[PDB]
Ligand SMILES: *[C@@H]1O[C@H](CO)[C@@H](O[C@@H]2O[C@H](CO)[C@@H](O)[C@H](O)[C@H]2NC(C)=O)[C@H](O)[C@H]1NC(C)=O
Ligand SMILES: *[C@@H]1O[C@H](CO)[C@@H](O[C@@H]2O[C@H](CO)[C@@H](O)[C@H](O)[C@H]2NC(C)=O)[C@H](O)[C@H]1NC(C)=O
Ligand SMILES: CCCCCCCC/C=C/CCCCCCCC(=O)OC[C@H](O)CO
Ligand SMILES: CCCCCCCC/C=C/CCCCCCCC(=O)OC[C@H](O)CO
Ligand SMILES: *C/C=C(C)/C=C/C=C(C)/C=C/C1=C(C)CCCC1(C)C
Ligand SMILES: *C/C=C(C)/C=C/C=C(C)/C=C/C1=C(C)CCCC1(C)C
């Protein structure tokens with residue numbers, strides 16, 4: 150191995166010179182200059198300060214205006230809630246971690262960071278599955294109502310927890326990645342005690358490949374066959390934005406899983422891991438730009 | 453002396469232990485932990501990312517709408533421009549300096565950071581002077597038009613440069629303060645080669661006390677003597693108050709240091725007032741949006 154494995158960590162840095170310390174015990178300045186940890190903290194502070202108001206204002210405007218009860222309005226409402234969970238539950242630990250250069254909260258902080266970021270990303274993915282069926286049902290007419298949308302909302306939480314929760318209780322585990330200031334799923338070690346390999350295959354199949362198969366099946370029909378046009382256009386951008394956000398992470402995660410112990414450094418996963426955290430803020434932005442009714446209501450309420 | 457004087461710095465940290473190093477040569481981790489410097493950089497990064505959009509949008513909306521040509525509109529447009537000089541000309545140096553924990557750009561970086569924040573703050577103060585006279589004439593009619601507003605705009609730049617420029621060319625100097633990641637006027641040392649003592653008196657009298665006397669004179673004449681005019685007077689009251697909240701803590705601590713040179717204070721003493729004052733680049737367009745209905749509608753129109 151070209152890294153350093155400990156009981157609950159894998160540092161992508163060789164301990165041949167003896168300088169590697171646990172990311173739960175001391176600042177990781179042996180693998181990066183302090184000013185680089187400070188950039189990660191400036192970034193996270195931005196995401197929190199931007200992420201909280203824009204998701205709260207999406208939530209506030211939707212509840213205030215009773216005309217926002219289409220299935221799209223419910224789904225965007227649900228995304229704002231999970232985004233708030235990501236900001237307050239996970240990103241506050243990311244900020245404090247990146248400020249101090251290591252996981253000052255110990256493994257409990259690593260679990261919070263990884264869990265809330267995994268949960269929110271999966272709620273967004275399975276939300277895209279719901280919108281793909283609604284668009285397929287309404288446009289093709291093979292009626293999608295409030296009951297269906299509200300059932301879809303509960304479905305996204307169940308699927309997301311089926312992915313985010315097991316690493317909390319012994320199936321795989323959350324481990325620090327990159328510069329050791331964020332946590333994800335353990336793609337790095339075998340660690341048979343927690344049956345790591347079977348979780349990763351289950352995560353990539355059930356909660357990455359299968360949802361994308363559903364989404365692209367439905368769009369395949371719409372391709373191969375005015376207010377609804379506005380909805381369909383927004384859902385196309387949301388699918389594209391999701392892929393830009395998560396594919397770099399997904400690709401590096403899968404490379405590491407199939408090249409365990411190989412020669413990669415700490416920046417390799419740091420950048421796709423922190424870019425993926427923009428997932429907590431981009432969805433309401435698309436909402437404001439591409440939904441005229443929601444934009445008018447936000448302008449009305451805020452002014 | 454309870455601090456360490458260098459050729460071009462004064463570190464508020466004793467060198468009896470030998471660890472003090474120049475803020476132009478090495479990170480200043482001997483007087484604060486690295487996570488404390490990271491907070492300054494995170495704070496500076498927020499200000500840059502908020503400061504550029506709201507000032508640029510304030511500029512853009514004002515130019516695009518012919519009906520925003522009152523003296524208030526001209527003064528606010530001029531504040532947006534100066535705020536943008538603060539963000540791009542000075543705050544970018546602050547961000548780099550906080551990230552690395554010392555002035556990697558050396559003395560030139562200290563001059564940019566101090567000059568643009570001093571220039572921006574003083575344009576704001578002399579702008580309040582201009583608005584106080586305009587309100588004074590408007591309410592009492594003892595007329596203030598578009599030529600006067602543009603003349604006032606030019607006046608605020610000349611006065612601000614008469615405060616910020618001399619320290620670039622040998623009357624006083626810009627010097628790091630606090631945790632050594634921002635710069636201000638040298639209240640710390642006598643340094644007779646730059647006649648430090650006379651500049652601070654000139655700054656506090658001409659560029660602090662005289663302007664406040666003018667502002668509060670015109671308010672006092674007004675306090676003892678339609679809808680649109682009342683809206684303008686209300687916003688000017690808030691602008692004066694917001695200036696005092698932003699700058700009085702800094703001016704108070706600066707004047708205390710001037711009169712207690714070499715006394716026992718640490719790096720946090722000036723750091724917090726110095727960085728709080730940097731919010732001056734942001735708050736003025738926010739009052740404008742909240743309290744001017746014509747401007748707010750023109751931005752909603754422009755933005756949507
Ligand atoms: C990296 O190597 C160093 C040096 O071998 C390890 O530090 C030693 O750890 C043992 C066990 O705790 C101590 O008894 C020694 O005294 C340590 N030596 C020194 C010089 O500190 C270190 O634990 C290794 N790091 C990791 C993460 O495994
Ligand atoms: C603070 O004190 C230290 C310790 O005396 C100074 O370091 C010395 O500086 C001289 C002048 O450059 C060198 O010749 C010595 O070799 C240094 N000694 C050590 C142990 O480093 C340091 O210059 C002082 N700092 C300030 C800002 O005055
Ligand atoms: C901790 C894990 C939790 C996982 C599970 C999360 C489930 C979230 C759903 C809540 C139901 C909310 C019901 C709100 C009902 C609103 C109904 C409405 O607005 O319309 C009514 C309409 O008349 C109909 O025909
Ligand atoms: C639809 C819009 C899509 C927009 C987004 C497109 C993303 C393209 C890149 C994906 C990441 C692929 C990761 C592959 C990593 C291979 C790295 C490798 O081989 O590097 C070895 C080296 O040793 C390491 O240090
Ligand atoms: C900074 C916090 C991070 C990087 C959290 C990571 C969370 C995951 C391991 C998420 C996995 C995925 C999604 C939520 C959507 C795309 C598919 C996955 C399985 C890669
Ligand atoms: C971080 C940048 C700083 C601290 C800039 C400092 C600027 C000054 C020296 C400002 C001076 C003043 C004003 C602009 C208004 C209030 C009165 C003064 C003279 C203290």
Ligand SMILES: *[C@@H]1O[C@H](CO)[C@@H](O)[C@H](O)[C@H]1NC(C)=O
Pocket residue numbers: 150151408409410411412
């Ligand atoms: C470590 O890196 C070298 C060079 O890239 C590689 O040949 C070796 O297989 C790596 N070790 C493991 C366990 O993959």
Ligand SMILES: *[C@@H]1O[C@H](CO)[C@@H](O)[C@H](O)[C@H]1NC(C)=O
Pocket residue numbers: 453454712713714715716
């Ligand atoms: C340094 O601090 C001590 C204690 O407050 C004080 O007695 C002394 O006068 C200070 N030195 C100077 C030069 O003010």
